[PDB]
Paper text:
In this study, we report the biochemical and structural analysis of a Bgl from the hemicellulose-degrading thermophilic anaerobe [name] (TsaBgl). Bgl cleaves β-1,4-glycosidic linkages in disaccharides and glucose-substituted polysaccharides and is involved in the utilization of polysaccharides as an energy source in cells.
To better elucidate the molecular function of TsaBgl, we determined the crystal structure of TsaBgl at 1.70 Å resolution. TsaBgl contained 16 α-helices and 13 β-strands, forming a single (β/α)8 TIM-barrel fold with dimensions of 55 × 55 × 50 Å. The conserved active site containing the crucial residues Glu163 (proton donor) and Glu351 (nucleophile), which are involved in the acid-base mechanism, is located in the center of the TIM-barrel. Temperature factor analysis showed that the core of the TIM-barrel of TsaBgl was highly rigid, whereas the loop between the β8-strand and α14-helix (named the β8-α14 loop) showed structural flexibility and was ~20 Å away from the substrate-binding entrance. The binding configuration of the Tris molecule in the active site of TsaBgl was similar to those in the structures TreBgl, ManBgl, and HthBgl, whereas the structures OsaBgl, SfrBgl, and ubBgl showed distinct binding configurations of Tris. The enzyme activity of TsaBgl was significantly inhibited by the Tris molecule. To better understand glucose recognition of TsaBgl, we performed a soaking experiment to bind glucose to TsaBgl; however, in all crystal structures, Tris, not glucose, was bound to the active site, indicating that glucose had lower binding affinity than Tris.
Author numbering: 1 to 444
Write the structure that this text describes.
């Protein structure tokens, strides 16, 4: 009768540094991203999040806009540098923003999903070594415990980390993201300290025994296809799958790093951070897994160097990120989790969406028909997973609004709502009107 049950959550998602602005107001100190965006050549045209969408000031208009679309759940992140702008120094004015935001969501029948860490590490923590310093587990634990104690009556759905693959490999190996190191050993140790920090928050959360409250983690996952049936392309796909997916899924859900990748990485860097006590903390039972899905990878063996797979273009339609539009991988990844990792545990899609070349036409509208078709194809796969016995509880579109897309600055637009940055005007895109209809009819 309904493709999506009344209890299924239709959501949208943002992140603190990507939308809030007010970067130096009410006691906020710099994050690693405020620092990184001011380093020459790190971010497109030296864009930064000083102002972004001005969501800090415009949050009531943004909540009313979500209520008018019929949004059922809102995923956002909490900015560590607003809450602890200096080590051990709590900022009540910081916490007050997240109380007024969550109060506005609950009064407009929107369920809050709060990401504790979405990449805006305080500069003070980075200056003490940041994710390379195992003491960060205690600093993160103190931060998480404060959020649980102050906001536990406001928020019942908690996500420890967003995309630890990005905070580790993209930030410390590839160097695209803050703080922008280029060292495999650092990226591997950071991946471990991120997961241990997740573990510490889970341990704290369970000790609080919070009424009807749930905790999880968000991972960016893909599907890797070999370019051919050759043994060479099979190993290339195995390594690329180990690098993106299994390096995080295995410690979290099996309590062991993937042994093929430990051996592979061990040829190039130290993997001596692995121990039983830490893996027990990392693998504590979660209430749900958040999946961030955008695209697949088709790979062929490269020159036998470190993670040097050649990226094959299979000749299909792509977004403005150059990401293939391949909706079948959404179903394939959710089934893989049901069969191999999460079994009957609740899953959410915590991000899915696309960047297109959006323009405001002379009629004042944004006719983003490619984003309408993108979302339609991916929701149809979510429906297929549900109809095949999948435990999918909700789907959060990335993003509510166009925002600061990290190293790309404002040059990539992911919103269902267009933002004219000169005026901070919000314009509903045709994708927003399509989504409003999907929530209302629950039919696709
Ligand atoms: Na910002
Ligand atoms: Na800048
Ligand atoms: Na678990």
């Amino acid at each position: 009768m309904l493709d999506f049950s009344k209890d299924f959550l239709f959501g949208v998602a943002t992140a603190s540094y990507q939308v809030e602005g007010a970067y130096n107001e009410d006691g906020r100190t710099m994050s690693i991203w405020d620092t990184f965006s001011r380093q020459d050549g790190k971010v497109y045209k030296s864009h930064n999040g000083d102002v972004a969408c001005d969501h800090y000031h415009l949050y009531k208009d943004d909540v009313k806009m979500m209520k008018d679309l019929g949004i059922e759940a809102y995923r956002f992140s909490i900015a560590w540098p607003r809450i602890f702008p200096a080590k051990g120094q709590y900022n009540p004015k910081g916490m007050d923003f997240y109380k007024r935001l969550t109060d506005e969501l609950l009064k407009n029948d929107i369920k809050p999903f709060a990401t504790i860490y979405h990449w805006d590490l305080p500069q003070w923590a980075d200056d003490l070594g940041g994710w390379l310093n195992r003491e960060i587990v205690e600093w993160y634990g103190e931060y998480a415990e404060k959020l649980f104690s102050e906001l536990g009556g406001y928020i019942k759905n908690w996500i420890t980390l967003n995309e630890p693959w990005c905070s580790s490999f993209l930030s410390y190996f590839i160097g695209e993201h803050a703080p922008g190191h280029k060292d495999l050993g650092e990226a591997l140790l950071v991946s471990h300290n991120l997961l241990l920090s997740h573990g510490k928050a889970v341990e704290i959360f369970r000790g609080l025994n919070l009424d009807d409250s749930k905790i999880g983690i968000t991972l960016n996952l893909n599907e890797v296809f070999p370019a051919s049936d050759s043994d060479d392309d099979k190993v290339a796909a195995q390594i690329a799958d180990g690098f993106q997916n299994r390096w995080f899924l295995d410690p979290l859900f099996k309590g062991k790093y993937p042994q093929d990748m430990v051996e592979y990485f061990g040829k190039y860097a130290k993997v001596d951070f692995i121990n039983d006590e830490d893996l027990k903390l990392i693998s504590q039972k979660l209430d749900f897994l958040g999946v961030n899905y955008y695209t697949r990878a088709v790979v062929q063996k490269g020159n036998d160097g470190l993670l040097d797979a050649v990226q094959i273009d299979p000749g299909n339609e792509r977004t403005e990120m150059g990401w293939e539009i391949y909706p079948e991988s959404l179903y394939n990844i959710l089934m893989r989790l049901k069969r191999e990792y999460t079994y009957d545990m609740p899953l959410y899609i915590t991000e899915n969406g696309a960047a297109f070349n959006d323009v405001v036409e002379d009629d004042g509208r944004v006719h983003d028909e490619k984003r309408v078709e993108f979302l339609k194809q991916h929701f149809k796969e979510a429906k297929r997973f549900l109809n095949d016995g999948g435990n999918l509880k909700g789907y959060f579109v990335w993003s509510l609004m166009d925002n600061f897309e990290w190293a790309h600055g404002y040059s990539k637009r992911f919103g269902i709502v267009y933002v004219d940055y000169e005026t901070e005007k919000r314009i509903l895109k045709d994708s927003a009107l399509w989504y409003k209809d999907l929530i209302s009819t629950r039919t696709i």
